[PDB]
């Protein structure tokens, strides 16, 4: 039963220096190394560096050299990496990964070989930002936007920290034709996100919709009625 | 990325198609070894090709590898649903000597015929007005396989900051959803004559538009 298992999520603030560990076992760890990748969102892979166990070399990736460090505890089969002064683009999902070679004695032909054994993941955000409830807005449909039987409404849930929100509709009585979208991130730091629902025009005047909004983060919830424009 | 891999690729289930894997002197020119790795959405990579052309035990053979002295390319046989990941090939690169992967290629394992987008633009609600804010909301829903580019335009000139555009999810009928946003100063938005956002859909281009002086 080979597995790394990775440390907990980190949030953190620009400056500021983040830790992550990744235990080994199922195999003899001194007979490896260790390699970090870290991931950003919707972007591809990104190599960082691998460390061997049995003698502590490291090669590093020259955008990341004085600013990284990784290093091994033998004695408790567990490898660790250290990203210093994090800025908000360091904001990625880390990963470590055992290269499948065995050092013989040099070390450096680690990096050459195919990472076989992966770490769940650790997500590491970086944001000047703390805990902050969300602004609600409405989305409401107009008489231009809606040509037919059906409109369009939903609620923009606005600059928030952190995840999660959750969305629903009238407390759960509307889910049909309700889509929420995944939350972005923002330079400012700060979590957006919008839900929808697609509704029959002949209720818009008498039924009552409610986007409903949880931020358990900031103790908070939010109950805004989308009413259609005058126009 | 180093490595040049094609943004997406696609096929029905039971063909068959290959990402390919370009770089240069320094790294697949070299004589150095490929690697290929896939990632299900949410989880971490797997192994699927090491040394151009090997299988690790456990991978199905439908997977495999071949190298050129410019290229390589992961050929997959007999689509089966599961083979919708991400691939990314991963080599070596000896410079003034790091590990360089490419830049991830998106396989769409096709269920159903392509859709082109639905576009819903939202102007800033007049609620966010008063909070000296304003945020264009473009939506998009429908559309398939689930990859688009998001452009914004202010009047007839293109828009390059304030754009956040979230990757594309699936909604119930496997088609997928995205939503993009415009954030704006009030006298941003009123001095501006229109504002549109543009979707790009397999080449094809939907733009909605918006203006502060027509109410919609």
């Known amino acids: 039963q080979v597995q790394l298992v990775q440390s907990g999520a980190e949030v953190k603030k620009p400056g500021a220096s983040v830790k992550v560990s990744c235990k080994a076992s199922?195999?003899?760890?001194?007979?490896?190394?260790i390699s970090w990748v870290r991931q950003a969102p919707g972007q591809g892979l990104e190599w960082m560096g691998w460390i061997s166990a049995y003698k502590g070399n490291t090669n590093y990736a020259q955008k990341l050299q004085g600013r990284v460090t990784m290093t091994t505890d033998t004695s408790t089969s567990t490898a660790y990496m250290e990203l210093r002064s994090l800025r908000s683009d360091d904001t990625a999902v880390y990963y470590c990964?055992?290269?499948?070679?065995?050092?013989?004695?040099?070390?450096?032909?680690?990096?050459?070989?195919?990472?076989?054994?992966w770490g769940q993941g650790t997500t590491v955000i970086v944001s000047s930002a703390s805990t902050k409830g969300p602004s609600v807005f409405p989305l409401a449909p107009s008489s231009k936007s809606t040509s037919g039987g059906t409109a369009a409404l939903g609620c923009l849930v606005k600059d928030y920290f952190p995840e999660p929100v959750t969305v629903s509709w009238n407390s759960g009585a509307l889910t049909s034709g309700v889509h929420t979208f995944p939350a972005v991130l923002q330079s400012s730091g700060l979590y957006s996100l919008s839900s929808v629902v697609t509704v029959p025009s002949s209720s818009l005047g008498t039924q009552t919709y409610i986007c409903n909004v949880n931020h358990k983060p900031s103790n908070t919830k939010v109950d805004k009625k989308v009413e259609p424009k005058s126009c | 990325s180093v490595l040049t891999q094609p943004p997406s690729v696609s096929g029905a289930p039971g063909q068959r198609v290959t990402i390919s894997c370009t770089g240069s002197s320094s790294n697949i020119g070299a004589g150095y070894d490929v690697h290929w790795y896939q990632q299900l959405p949410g989880t971490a990579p797997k192994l699927l090709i090491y040394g151009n052309t090997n299988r690790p035990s456990g991978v199905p053979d439908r997977f495999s590898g071949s190298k050129s002295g410019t290229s390589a390319s992961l050929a997959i046989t007999g689509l089966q649903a599961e083979d919708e990941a991400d691939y990314y090939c991963?080599?070596?690169?000896?410079?003034?000597?790091?590990?360089?992967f490419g830049g991830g290629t998106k396989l769409t394992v096709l269920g159903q015929p392509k859709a082109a987008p639905s576009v819903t633009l939202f102007p800033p609600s007049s609620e966010e007005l008063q909070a000296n804010k304003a945020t264009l909301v473009c939506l998009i829903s429908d559309f398939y396989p689930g990859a688009v580019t998001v452009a914004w335009k202010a009047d007839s000139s293109p828009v390059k900051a304030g754009v956040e555009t979230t990757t594309p999810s699936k909604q119930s009928n496997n088609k997928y959803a995205a939503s993009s946003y415009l954030s704006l100063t009030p006298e941003q938005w009123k001095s501006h004559r229109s504002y549109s956002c543009q979707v790009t859909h397999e080449g094809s281009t939907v733009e909605k538009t918006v203006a502060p002086t027509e109410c919609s």
């Open positions: 199922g195999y003899t760890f001194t007979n490896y190394g």
């Open positions: 990964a055992r290269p499948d070679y065995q050092v013989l004695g040099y070390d450096f032909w680690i990096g050459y070989y195919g990472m076989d054994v």
């Open positions: 991963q080599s070596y690169d000896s410079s003034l000597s790091e590990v360089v």
